[PDB]
Amino acid sequence: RSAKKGAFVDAHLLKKVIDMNKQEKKRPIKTWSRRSTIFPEFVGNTFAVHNGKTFINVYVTDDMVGHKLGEFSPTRNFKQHTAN
Amino acid sequence: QKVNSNGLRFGINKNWISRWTANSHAQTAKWLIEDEKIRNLFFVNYRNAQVSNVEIERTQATVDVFVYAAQPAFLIGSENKNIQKITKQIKQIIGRTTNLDLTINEIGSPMLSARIIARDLANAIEARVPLRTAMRQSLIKVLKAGANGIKVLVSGRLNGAEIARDKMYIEGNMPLSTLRADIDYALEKAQTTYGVIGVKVWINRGMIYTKGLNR
Amino acid sequence: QSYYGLGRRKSSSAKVYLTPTQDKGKITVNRRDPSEYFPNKLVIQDMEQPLDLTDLKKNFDINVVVKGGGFTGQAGAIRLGIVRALLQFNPELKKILKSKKLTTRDKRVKERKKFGLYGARRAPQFTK
Amino acid sequence: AKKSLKVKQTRIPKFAVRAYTRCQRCGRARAVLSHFGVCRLCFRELAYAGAIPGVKKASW
Amino acid sequence: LGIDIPNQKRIEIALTYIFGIGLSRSQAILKQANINPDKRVKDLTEEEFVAIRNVASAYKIEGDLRREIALNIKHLSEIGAWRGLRHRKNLPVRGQRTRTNARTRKGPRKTVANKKIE
Amino acid sequence: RKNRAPKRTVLPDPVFNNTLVTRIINVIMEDGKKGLAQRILYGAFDLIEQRTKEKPLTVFERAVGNVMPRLELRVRRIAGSNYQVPTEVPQDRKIALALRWIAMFARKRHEKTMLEKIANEIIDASNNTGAAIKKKDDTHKMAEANKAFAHMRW
Amino acid sequence: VKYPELKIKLESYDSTLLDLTTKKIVEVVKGVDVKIKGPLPLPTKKEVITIIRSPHVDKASREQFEKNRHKRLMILVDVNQGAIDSLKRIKIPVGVTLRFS
RNA sequence: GGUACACGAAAAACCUUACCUAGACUUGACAUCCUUGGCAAAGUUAUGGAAACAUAAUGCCGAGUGACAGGUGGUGCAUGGUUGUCGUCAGCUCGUGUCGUGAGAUGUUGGGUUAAGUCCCGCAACGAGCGCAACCCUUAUCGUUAGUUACAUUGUCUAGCGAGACUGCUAAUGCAAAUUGGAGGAAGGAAGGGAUGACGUCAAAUCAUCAUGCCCCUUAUGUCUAGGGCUGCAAACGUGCUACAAUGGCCAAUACAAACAGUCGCCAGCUUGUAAAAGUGAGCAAAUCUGUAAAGUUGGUCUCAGUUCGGAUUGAGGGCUGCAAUUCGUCCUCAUGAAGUCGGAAUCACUAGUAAUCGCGAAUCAGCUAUGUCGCGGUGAAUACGUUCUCG
C-alpha cells in the first residue's frame, strides 16, 4: 500500500500472521523485513524489527492504513538527547 | 605537478592498439574485456623473448589479430611448436567456432616501446651482476640498435628500505611540451620482497614530420 | 540584384538575400513579423542599424533565413549577414561596418563552463 | 572480505529492489559507469592506457 | 470564509496566509462566489456577501481541520513509527538531516560550542 | 602588479547618443542582463519627461556631473597602520565612480514602482539636494585632515 | 531492387577512416550506380566524460576524456545487380561502422 | 589550519556496506593438490522461514576433497602506481672548461631585452638537456565536399579539407630582442582559449581504487540471505542555494536554440485531467520521431510588507517504478506561509561573454528533495589609481 496504489502486501510477513490467524492468534513473530503493509488483522500485533543488532518490538493497530511495516517501526536511532 | 603523461599523449603521440566496435552499449565492455585478455595472454606469456604488441582489430564480427614477434624462433621454433599451443589456448578464450587469424609481422627498431625496456631494466637491476655495468650495457643496446631519446626511471627502494641512488636517465628528444614527440610511455609494478617497485619508461619512436594524427 | 550575405553570432547562423528596391525594406525575419519573435527592446530598433549605418532601410528587402541561437545572437548574425550583403553590393560601406567589427565575424560566444567550475570561471568560496 | 564484494558483484540480487555494480578489479563501487561496469579509478587508469579507442584530452 | 479579508486590496490572494485556505481553495471560494479578481478592491460584490453566509459559510470550518490534523498527528506520533519518532523529536519528519538544516524547528540556528575532532 | 589597462564600455545608445546612460545600463542590470533593464530605464526617461518637464539629456548630465570627485587618497601603509596621500584621481575612475554612485543611489526609497523612485533620485541629483551630491561633498571635505598629509610623502 | 532506399550511415571516431570508406563507396559506385549522395559530414555528437583523479578525495582538477562521434550519411536510393557486381569490393574498416538501411 | 572536507561518492529501500548482527557457511560462493568420469549444479512448482540454509525431482557436462582460494586484515617513513600545493614559476640542471686548496660559481649570469635561458651586447665560458615558449587542437574569412531525415527564404546544416597573417607591409626603429602607425585581413602583432606545472617541496596524499613487501586468518579475516547508517542530532563549520521583492509576485500569449538520450525505451498524437498520473498510440536502432526553450518580449495585476517576496517545515490524498514505497528514493495536488525587509570578523570567480541570469538534455539513474555534476545554449557587467598590505 502506497500513495500511488491501493492496499497491496508482499504477503510473506502477513503470511505467518495469517498462518497463526487460523489458529487463535498470538502476535509476536520473528519478522524484521519491511515489505508488508498492514490490514485490519495487524491490530494488536507486534514484530521484532531489526535496528542494527537487536529486533525491537513495534505495536501495530488500525489507526491509519497508508504505510508499510517499515514505517511502523523506528528504523534508526536518535541522539538520545545527548549534548556530546 | 606534472600530470601523468600516459593518457596526455595517446591519440596525439601514442597509437591505439586494440580497436573494437560493437552495437548499443551492452556488450561493449565484454568486447573490451575479451580483447584485453586475449592480447595480454601474449604479454604475460613471454618476458625473455619480449613480445611487444598484438593488435586485435575487431569490428562487427570481423576480428583481425597481428602478432609482432621479435624472435620467430621463440614464437614458432621447430614444427611451429609454440604457435599451435596458442592456436589451442586462445581457442578456449576467443571461441571454438570463430576463426583464429594472426601472422608474425616484421618491424624495424623493435625497442621503441617502453614495457619491454622497463622489464629489461628491472632484470638488470636484479640480475646478480654489477648493476651499473648492466644498465650501461642495456641503455647502450637500446640506443644502438635503432631508437630515439630514452627516459628510464626506477622508483621504490634499493633492495632495502630506501631508494637513495635512483638514476634518472634522459637522452635525446624528451619534450613533454611538444605534441608531436611520438613518445610511448609505460609503467611496471615489479613484485619483490621490498614492496612494489615502479619502473617507468618514456621512449621516442621517431620524429614524425609535424604530425598530430594517429599514424 | 542578388546580394548574398552570411552571418554568425552566439550560436546563431543566418543568410540574407538583399536586392535593390523602393519598398519599406521588407523588415522581417524568416518572412514573419518580429512582434513576439524577438523581445521589444532597443534590439528591435538596432535590428536595422546596419541599414542605419549604410543606405537607408527603404532599400534591400531583407530575405533572411536563420538557424539556432536566441534573439541578440540571432540579431547579430542577421546584421552580420546584412553588412556582408552590403559588401556584396557596395563595399565602400564595408569600411565603417568593419570598423565596429560587423563585416568581420564578432566571434563572441558564451565561454564554455569547465569541469568542477560552476561556470566558465565561477568557483566556490573556500578559504580554509 | 573484498572477495565477498566481488562475488556479490558477479551475482545478481533476486529483486530489482537490490541492485548495484562495481569494477571487475576495483572495490569501492561508488561512481561506477553502466557503459563499461568499471570503477572510476580503473576506468581512468585504463583510459590513460588508451584501452578504449578514442579516449583523448580535451583542448576544445 | 471571512478571515484575512483585506481592505482596498485584492481579496483574491490575501487568504493564502490563512491556516487551511491556500491559493487553490481561496480561488475556489472566490470563483464559487464569482468575486471577479479586483483592482485593489476589498470586495467587488456587496449583495453576494449575504450569499457568502448562504453558501461560503457552508464551507468546512478550518478550526475543525486544525484539530483533525492534530489528532492524526497524535495517532501517527504515539504509535511506533520512524516518522512518529521524528514527530516526537520536533524535527523534519519525512527525513532531512539536522546537521545544519532544520532552521524552522530548532530556532534560528542557535550557535553553540563545537564538540568535534580534537 | 597590474598597470594601466583599457576598459570595455558599450557605445552610446542610438535613441539618446549618451555613453553615460549606457554605462548606467551596464551597471544596473538585474540578474546581469539587459534584456529587462532597458525597458524600465526608457520608462524612467519617460517618467522624467512628464515630471517637472526635464529632458533626459540635460537632467541626467546635471545629475551625474555634480557627483564626481577630484582627489585620490592613495593608500600608503606601515604594516601596522595606514594613511592616505592626496594625488589627482584618474579621470576614467572619476567618471566611473560618478556613474556608479548615480546608479546605485538611483534605485532606493522602496515604493510602489521603481519608475517613481528612479525619476525621483534623478530629480534630486538634478536639484542638488542631498542624495548623491554628498559623495562629491565628502571626497573633498574629509580631505582636510588628509590635506595635512599632503605636506609630506611616505 | 536490393534496397528501395539505402540510408546507410557510416560513423566512427576517426575521420580519415570515414573519409576513406566514403570515397571508396563514391568512386566504386561512380559509373555503375546513380541517385547517390557523396561524402556528407554531419554534425558531430561529441561529448566529454569527467572523472576524479586522485585515488582518494580530490575535486580541484577533474580529469576529462573526449569521445567524438562523426556521421557520414550515404543515400543510395537504388541498388542494382550490376551495382553489387561492381561493389563486391567494399569492406567494413576496423573503426568505421556501416548501417544496413 | 590551507596541501582534510556539495568529500573518496556521476543517484543507499535493505546489497553498495568496507559496520553491526539474526537465519545460516566449515578448505568454505568462488579457486584448486587429489580423484574419476559420464551428461548437467541451473530455474521452477510446495515449504520452517525474513530468504537462506534444511526440502525432492525437473532443466558436451560435471563432481567431491589438503595446501589455499581469498582477506576493505592491518602496516602511505616500508612502498609502487596514481593525485594535488608552491608552479603554466620563469626559470632548473648537466657534458666539456676556468678558477676559488673548497663547499661551488659557472654556462643560466646579466644591459636593454621576452610568453621562454626571448634575441643580440658583453660575460671564464662553449654547448646541450629540462621546463616554458613554440609545435599542436579549438573560436574566428574565402573557396572546396556532398547533398537528405538540412533545406525547401535548398547548399541555410555539417565538418573532411585547402588558400589562409607569421612585424606580413610601411614609418616612427632600439647594435639586438620587439611595441605600435593605417589598410588589406579570420587572425596584426604572445589573435583568444586548452595544453604537457623542470629538480624539488609538503620526510606530500594513496596500504581502503589497484599492485602491494613482512606477518597473520583460514572449520575465519570463507561465503548465502534479512534488516539498519551513509539524509540521525546538542549540533557547528563548509557548500552553493532560497528569497529578503515592484525589471518583482501572480495571470495570460510568448519567439529563438544548442545539446544529448531513447527499441517491449524517447514514447508523439488522443482523452480524463489544475497536476502527478490514468488509459491510449505511431515514427524514431536516433538531421526521420519523441523528450517545451525560457528568461526577455507583450498587457493587466499587486502599489510596501515578513508582504501576491520568500515559499520553510509540516499533515492529508492521489503517483512513478521497484515482487511490495516507509526508513535507505521520488512526483503531483491540496493545506501550512517561519525566519531573512540585504546581515561583522571572513570573503571567494572575474578582465566579455567576464560576474551574473534563464531554461534545456543527459552521466550515474527501474528511484532520486544530487537545491549537485557533465555539459549546452539564450541574455548579459563596470573596472584595473598602483601594488599601498599580503601571497607566490
GROMACS .gro file of C-alpha atoms (C1' of nucleotides) in nm, chain H residues 29-320:
model
  292
  889A      C1'    1   3.031  -1.898  -0.303
  890C      C1'    2   3.446  -1.886  -0.590
  891A      C1'    3   3.971  -2.129  -0.651
  892U      C1'    4   4.227  -2.565  -0.683
  893C      C1'    5   4.650  -3.059  -0.498
  894C      C1'    6   4.395  -3.521  -0.548
  895U      C1'    7   4.035  -3.840  -0.781
  896U      C1'    8   3.742  -4.022  -1.152
  897G      C1'    9   3.436  -3.985  -1.538
  898G      C1'   10   2.971  -3.972  -1.761
  899C      C1'   11   2.571  -3.553  -1.916
  900A      C1'   12   2.414  -3.146  -1.632
  901A      C1'   13   2.468  -2.769  -1.031
  902A      C1'   14   2.085  -2.430  -1.320
  903G      C1'   15   1.537  -2.206  -1.285
  904U      C1'   16   1.059  -2.369  -1.145
  905U      C1'   17   0.647  -2.568  -0.868
  906A      C1'   18   0.513  -2.652  -0.216
  907U      C1'   19   0.752  -2.545   0.228
  908G      C1'   20   1.027  -2.385   0.859
  909G      C1'   21   1.140  -1.930   0.722
  910A      C1'   22   1.265  -1.252   0.651
  911A      C1'   23   1.508  -1.572   0.241
  912A      C1'   24   1.886  -1.856   0.300
  913C      C1'   25   2.025  -2.254   0.490
  914A      C1'   26   1.738  -2.757   0.555
  915U      C1'   27   1.317  -2.965   0.135
  916A      C1'   28   1.264  -3.385  -0.355
  917A      C1'   29   1.283  -3.413  -0.859
  918U      C1'   30   1.254  -3.102  -1.303
  919G      C1'   31   1.646  -2.838  -1.679
  920C      C1'   32   2.931  -3.189  -2.417
  921C      C1'   33   2.864  -3.167  -1.896
  922G      C1'   34   3.016  -3.223  -1.417
  923A      C1'   35   3.159  -3.374  -0.949
  924G      C1'   36   3.396  -3.409  -0.406
  925U      C1'   37   3.816  -3.328  -0.128
  926G      C1'   38   4.457  -3.079   0.182
  927A      C1'   39   4.779  -2.666   0.096
  928C      C1'   40   4.489  -2.247  -0.013
  929A      C1'   41   4.113  -1.957  -0.268
  930G      C1'   42   4.079  -1.517  -0.071
  931G      C1'   43   4.148  -1.132   0.306
  932U      C1'   44   3.803  -0.318   0.268
  933G      C1'   45   4.327  -0.751   0.775
  934G      C1'   46   4.610  -0.418   0.938
  935U      C1'   47   5.129  -0.188   0.842
  936G      C1'   48   5.132   0.568   0.297
  937C      C1'   49   5.869   0.700   0.662
  938A      C1'   50   5.809   0.010   0.439
  939U      C1'   51   5.607   0.113  -0.090
  940G      C1'   52   5.478   0.144  -0.631
  941G      C1'   53   5.111   0.316  -0.932
  942U      C1'   54   4.801   0.749  -0.924
  943U      C1'   55   4.698   1.267  -0.749
  944G      C1'   56   4.714   1.784  -0.573
  945U      C1'   57   5.037   2.265  -0.334
  946C      C1'   58   5.404   2.623  -0.439
  947G      C1'   59   5.401   2.643  -1.050
  948U      C1'   60   5.190   2.703  -1.678
  949C      C1'   61   5.713   2.992  -1.163
  950A      C1'   62   6.032   3.188  -1.509
  951G      C1'   63   6.346   2.987  -1.460
  952C      C1'   64   6.610   2.440  -1.335
  953U      C1'   65   7.028   2.122  -1.416
  954C      C1'   66   7.446   1.872  -1.674
  955G      C1'   67   7.885   1.739  -2.069
  956U      C1'   68   8.327   1.988  -2.163
  957G      C1'   69   8.603   2.408  -1.916
  958U      C1'   70   8.827   2.814  -1.582
  959C      C1'   71   8.917   2.939  -1.104
  960G      C1'   72   8.843   2.993  -0.578
  961U      C1'   73   9.305   2.426  -0.194
  962G      C1'   74   8.663   2.427  -0.137
  963A      C1'   75   8.188   2.397  -0.038
  964G      C1'   76   8.085   2.569  -0.580
  965A      C1'   77   8.032   2.986  -0.917
  966U      C1'   78   7.985   2.881  -1.390
  967G      C1'   79   7.743   2.826  -1.897
  968U      C1'   80   7.173   3.009  -1.683
  969U      C1'   81   7.479   3.509  -1.507
  970G      C1'   82   7.349   3.998  -1.663
  971G      C1'   83   7.228   4.587  -2.014
  972G      C1'   84   6.841   4.690  -2.293
  973U      C1'   85   6.552   4.287  -2.395
  974U      C1'   86   6.095   3.828  -2.364
  975A      C1'   87   5.513   3.417  -2.341
  976A      C1'   88   6.065   3.131  -2.258
  977G      C1'   89   6.752   3.095  -2.059
  978U      C1'   90   6.319   3.575  -2.595
  979C      C1'   91   6.740   3.796  -2.900
  980C      C1'   92   7.173   4.020  -2.956
  981C      C1'   93   7.572   4.335  -2.643
  982G      C1'   94   7.919   4.175  -2.322
  983C      C1'   95   8.007   3.764  -1.959
  984A      C1'   96   8.553   3.207  -1.768
  985A      C1'   97   8.286   3.035  -2.078
  986C      C1'   98   8.141   2.691  -2.545
  987G      C1'   99   7.749   2.397  -2.577
  988A      C1'  100   7.348   2.052  -2.470
  989G      C1'  101   6.946   1.862  -2.186
  990C      C1'  102   6.460   2.002  -1.867
  991G      C1'  103   6.078   2.340  -1.845
  992C      C1'  104   5.835   2.722  -2.080
  993A      C1'  105   5.759   2.929  -2.515
  994A      C1'  106   5.691   2.743  -2.957
  995C      C1'  107   5.481   2.273  -3.240
  996C      C1'  108   4.951   2.101  -3.166
  997C      C1'  109   4.378   2.137  -3.104
  998U      C1'  110   3.986   2.467  -3.069
  999U      C1'  111   3.656   3.032  -3.195
 1000A      C1'  112   3.748   3.332  -3.587
 1001U      C1'  113   3.741   3.476  -4.353
 1002C      C1'  114   3.710   3.280  -4.872
 1003G      C1'  115   3.686   2.854  -5.160
 1004U      C1'  116   3.624   2.341  -5.176
 1005U      C1'  117   3.266   1.802  -5.006
 1006A      C1'  118   2.818   1.601  -5.077
 1007G      C1'  119   2.354   1.651  -5.073
 1008U      C1'  120   1.900   1.412  -4.730
 1009U      C1'  121   1.571   1.278  -4.249
 1010A      C1'  122   1.926   2.017  -4.356
 1011C      C1'  123   1.672   2.262  -4.658
 1012A      C1'  124   1.292   2.362  -4.945
 1013U      C1'  125   1.384   3.242  -4.769
 1014U      C1'  126   1.781   2.448  -5.085
 1015G      C1'  127   2.372   2.441  -5.040
 1016U      C1'  128   2.056   2.758  -4.483
 1017C      C1'  129   2.337   2.203  -4.191
 1018U      C1'  130   2.783   1.983  -4.143
 1019A      C1'  131   3.300   1.908  -4.078
 1020G      C1'  132   3.680   1.639  -4.416
 1021C      C1'  133   3.996   1.972  -4.647
 1022G      C1'  134   4.264   2.360  -4.895
 1023A      C1'  135   4.413   2.935  -4.968
 1024G      C1'  136   4.482   3.137  -4.519
 1025A      C1'  137   4.859   3.653  -4.135
 1026C      C1'  138   5.357   3.496  -3.920
 1027U      C1'  139   5.604   4.280  -3.769
 1028G      C1'  140   5.332   4.031  -4.336
 1029C      C1'  141   5.396   4.570  -4.516
 1030U      C1'  142   5.522   5.084  -4.425
 1031A      C1'  143   5.730   5.461  -4.071
 1032A      C1'  144   5.803   5.624  -3.604
 1033U      C1'  145   6.329   5.187  -3.528
 1034G      C1'  146   6.635   5.030  -3.030
 1035C      C1'  147   7.396   4.719  -3.203
 1036A      C1'  148   6.995   4.332  -3.098
 1037A      C1'  149   6.512   4.147  -2.885
 1038A      C1'  150   6.046   4.373  -3.007
 1039U      C1'  151   5.593   4.765  -2.938
 1040U      C1'  152   5.259   5.046  -3.216
 1041G      C1'  153   5.108   5.365  -3.720
 1042G      C1'  154   4.681   5.261  -4.138
 1043A      C1'  155   4.494   4.925  -4.475
 1044G      C1'  156   4.433   4.451  -4.677
 1045G      C1'  157   4.256   4.088  -4.315
 1046A      C1'  158   3.982   3.538  -3.999
 1047A      C1'  159   4.380   3.639  -3.726
 1048G      C1'  160   4.838   4.246  -3.682
 1049G      C1'  161   5.144   4.175  -3.356
 1050A      C1'  162   5.210   3.601  -2.705
 1051A      C1'  163   4.500   3.694  -3.217
 1052G      C1'  164   4.154   3.428  -2.771
 1053G      C1'  165   4.100   2.969  -2.501
 1054G      C1'  166   4.320   2.449  -2.375
 1055A      C1'  167   4.799   2.221  -2.344
 1056U      C1'  168   5.223   1.879  -2.106
 1057G      C1'  169   5.323   2.299  -1.390
 1058A      C1'  170   6.192   2.110  -1.474
 1059C      C1'  171   6.493   1.929  -0.985
 1060G      C1'  172   6.246   1.951  -0.583
 1061U      C1'  173   5.857   2.098  -0.165
 1062C      C1'  174   5.469   1.917   0.151
 1063A      C1'  175   6.012   1.313   0.517
 1064A      C1'  176   5.322   1.524   0.024
 1065A      C1'  177   4.815   1.244  -0.025
 1066U      C1'  178   4.715   0.672  -0.187
 1067C      C1'  179   4.803   0.015   0.242
 1068A      C1'  180   4.069   0.135   0.191
 1069U      C1'  181   4.100   0.203  -0.617
 1070C      C1'  182   4.452  -0.105  -0.780
 1071A      C1'  183   4.962  -0.388  -0.718
 1072U      C1'  184   5.121  -0.446  -0.275
 1073G      C1'  185   5.671  -0.632   0.091
 1074C      C1'  186   5.651  -0.854   0.645
 1075C      C1'  187   5.330  -1.104   0.943
 1076C      C1'  188   4.857  -1.303   1.015
 1077C      C1'  189   4.344  -1.575   0.941
 1078U      C1'  190   4.167  -1.991   0.746
 1079U      C1'  191   3.614  -2.531   1.027
 1080A      C1'  192   3.765  -1.730   0.971
 1081U      C1'  193   3.998  -1.221   0.809
 1082G      C1'  194   3.531  -1.808   0.385
 1083U      C1'  195   3.079  -1.741   0.190
 1084C      C1'  196   2.425  -1.704   0.128
 1085U      C1'  197   2.005  -1.425   0.291
 1086A      C1'  198   1.722  -1.047   0.624
 1087G      C1'  199   1.734  -0.574   0.831
 1088G      C1'  200   1.951  -0.066   0.952
 1089G      C1'  201   2.357   0.424   0.871
 1090C      C1'  202   2.584   0.651   0.493
 1091U      C1'  203   1.959   1.232   0.483
 1092G      C1'  204   2.021   1.082   1.290
 1093C      C1'  205   2.120   1.512   1.624
 1094A      C1'  206   2.306   1.900   2.141
 1095A      C1'  207   2.472   2.016   1.698
 1096A      C1'  208   2.899   2.370   1.447
 1097C      C1'  209   3.191   2.454   1.041
 1098G      C1'  210   3.158   2.413   0.499
 1099U      C1'  211   2.886   2.443   0.042
 1100G      C1'  212   2.612   2.660  -0.329
 1101C      C1'  213   2.140   2.770  -0.273
 1102U      C1'  214   1.642   3.048  -0.102
 1103A      C1'  215   1.444   3.499  -0.116
 1104C      C1'  216   1.467   3.943   0.150
 1105A      C1'  217   1.050   4.191  -0.398
 1106A      C1'  218   0.773   4.607  -0.752
 1107U      C1'  219   1.296   4.467  -1.418
 1108G      C1'  220   0.944   4.184  -0.853
 1109G      C1'  221   0.485   3.826  -0.735
 1110C      C1'  222   0.063   3.627  -0.985
 1111C      C1'  223  -0.224   3.559  -1.455
 1112A      C1'  224  -0.242   3.501  -1.980
 1113A      C1'  225   0.018   3.461  -2.523
 1114U      C1'  226   0.515   3.424  -2.576
 1115A      C1'  227   0.985   3.350  -3.013
 1116C      C1'  228   1.495   3.193  -3.063
 1117A      C1'  229   1.813   2.711  -2.971
 1118A      C1'  230   2.233   2.408  -2.871
 1119A      C1'  231   2.268   1.965  -2.657
 1120C      C1'  232   2.232   1.472  -2.563
 1121A      C1'  233   1.906   1.039  -2.464
 1122G      C1'  234   1.599   0.677  -2.650
 1123U      C1'  235   1.357  -0.005  -2.944
 1124C      C1'  236   0.879  -0.418  -2.501
 1125G      C1'  237   1.279   0.286  -2.436
 1126C      C1'  238   1.209   0.854  -2.626
 1127C      C1'  239   0.714   0.748  -2.619
 1128A      C1'  240   0.427   1.179  -3.032
 1129G      C1'  241  -0.068   1.202  -3.100
 1130C      C1'  242  -0.560   1.144  -2.822
 1131U      C1'  243  -0.872   1.162  -2.386
 1132U      C1'  244  -0.962   1.213  -1.841
 1133G      C1'  245  -0.720   1.569  -1.635
 1134U      C1'  246  -0.502   2.228  -1.208
 1135A      C1'  247  -0.107   1.826  -1.198
 1136A      C1'  248   0.141   1.393  -1.079
 1137A      C1'  249  -0.066   1.041  -1.316
 1138A      C1'  250  -0.457   0.709  -1.560
 1139G      C1'  251  -0.558   0.494  -2.008
 1140U      C1'  252  -0.440   0.534  -2.506
 1141G      C1'  253  -0.081   0.513  -2.961
 1142A      C1'  254   0.260   0.572  -3.423
 1143G      C1'  255   0.762   0.738  -3.608
 1144C      C1'  256   1.229   0.709  -3.406
 1145A      C1'  257   1.803   0.135  -3.356
 1146A      C1'  258   1.803   0.814  -3.347
 1147A      C1'  259   1.941   1.555  -3.918
 1148U      C1'  260   1.329   1.074  -3.970
 1149C      C1'  261   1.019   1.070  -3.428
 1150U      C1'  262   0.994   1.193  -2.944
 1151G      C1'  263   1.177   1.429  -2.466
 1152U      C1'  264   0.858   2.274  -2.438
 1153A      C1'  265   1.342   2.673  -2.492
 1154A      C1'  266   1.292   3.004  -2.119
 1155A      C1'  267   1.428   3.442  -1.910
 1156G      C1'  268   1.312   3.853  -2.244
 1157U      C1'  269   0.909   4.018  -2.504
 1158U      C1'  270   0.352   4.162  -2.486
 1159G      C1'  271  -0.085   4.378  -2.138
 1160G      C1'  272  -0.339   4.363  -1.651
 1161U      C1'  273  -0.216   4.291  -1.169
 1162C      C1'  274  -0.010   4.371  -0.671
 1163U      C1'  275   0.142   4.963  -0.502
 1164C      C1'  276   0.528   4.817   0.069
 1165A      C1'  277   0.550   4.427   0.387
 1166G      C1'  278   0.756   3.921   0.677
 1167U      C1'  279   0.444   4.133   0.219
 1168U      C1'  280   0.077   3.827  -0.421
 1169C      C1'  281   0.853   3.827  -0.164
 1170G      C1'  282   1.041   3.412   0.016
 1171G      C1'  283   0.763   2.964  -0.002
 1172A      C1'  284   1.044   2.672   0.546
 1173U      C1'  285   0.877   2.256   0.779
 1174U      C1'  286   0.452   2.017   0.820
 1175G      C1'  287  -0.045   1.697   0.762
 1176A      C1'  288  -0.396   1.460   0.410
 1177G      C1'  289  -0.498   1.244  -0.059
 1178G      C1'  290  -0.358   1.069  -0.508
 1179G      C1'  291   0.175   0.899  -0.834
 1180C      C1'  292   0.626   0.661  -1.063
   0.00000   0.00000   0.00000
